[PDB]
Amino acid sequence: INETADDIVYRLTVIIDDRYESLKNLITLRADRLEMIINDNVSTILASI
Amino acid sequence: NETADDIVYRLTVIIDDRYESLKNLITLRADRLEMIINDNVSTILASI
Amino acid sequence: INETADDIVYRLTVIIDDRYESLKNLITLRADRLEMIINDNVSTILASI
Amino acid sequence: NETADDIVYRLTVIIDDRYESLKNLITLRADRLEMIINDNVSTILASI
Numbered sequence: 525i526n527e528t529a530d531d532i533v534y535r536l537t538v539i540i541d542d543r544y545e546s547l548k549n550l551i552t553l554r555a556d557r558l559e560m561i562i563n564d565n566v567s568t569i570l571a572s573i
Numbered sequence: 574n575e576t577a578d579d580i581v582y583r584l585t586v587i588i589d590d591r592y593e594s595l596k597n598l599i600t601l602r603a604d605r606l607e608m609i610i611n612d613n614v615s616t617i618l619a620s621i
Numbered sequence: 622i623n624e625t626a627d628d629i630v631y632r633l634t635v636i637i638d639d640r641y642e643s644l645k646n647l648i649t650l651r652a653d654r655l656e657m658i659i660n661d662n663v664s665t666i667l668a669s670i
Numbered sequence: 671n672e673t674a675d676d677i678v679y680r681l682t683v684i685i686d687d688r689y690e691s692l693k694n695l696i697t698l699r700a701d702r703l704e705m706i707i708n709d710n711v712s713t714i715l716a717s718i
């Protein structure tokens with residue numbers, strides 16, 4: 525039944541890994557954009573005075 | 574190996590549910606931070 | 622072996638649930654603080670002109 | 671039920687590892703956003 529155990533762990537590892545990479549990507553996505561937005565607005569505040 | 578299938582399935586449902594929840598939360602707070610920032614930028618530019 | 626299956630799922634559900642609540646708490650923690658920081662700084666920019 | 675123990679253990683290690691990684695990332699980006707904000711606040715206040 526060890527091969528079954530191996531398959532159980534492997535299949536859920538793939539699942540866990542996939543959702544992990546997706547959450548990493550999303551966190552990175554929103555953070556990059558928040559930085560962009562902030563740096564853009566700072567340029568306007570300083571641009572207009 | 575039907576038992577194996579059910580174990581994987583039951584935990585996949587759990588993993589997927591918590592994943593969708595964390596996604597939703599991240600989107601919620603990021604969207605709000607964007608709104609807040611754009612709001613305050615208007616106030617600063619609106620006050621000179 | 623169904624009781625074993627049940628125990629496997631339960632034990633990993635507890636684990637998954639715990640790490641979930643922790644990540645939620647952390648996301649909430651940092652977001653609340655970013656909002657606080659932003660709103661504080663806006664008060665200074667507007668306070669000093 | 672040693673096989674059961676190893677299944678739980680092996681997946682607990684995986685779950686814990688990805689959890690610590692996501693924590694670290696969240697802390698990394700939040701810390702950086704705080705630094706960026708405090709930096710720009712100084713520039714705006716330093717320019718009038």
Ligand SMILES: c1cc2ccc3cccc4ccc(c1)c2c34
Pocket residue numbers: 540541542543544545547588589591592637638639640641642644685686688689
């Ligand atoms: C709760 C805790 C988690 C820890 C680590 C994870 C890694 C990848 C995807 C995940 C999805 C959902 C989780 C829920 C979670 C994940």
Ligand SMILES: c1cc2ccc3cccc4ccc(c1)c2c34
Pocket residue numbers: 550551552553554555556558598599600602603647648649650651652653655696699700701703
């Ligand atoms: C990208 C997305 C985020 C969503 C929610 C957050 C909550 C608190 C601090 C955060 C910092 C950085 C993020 C980047 C981010 C945060």
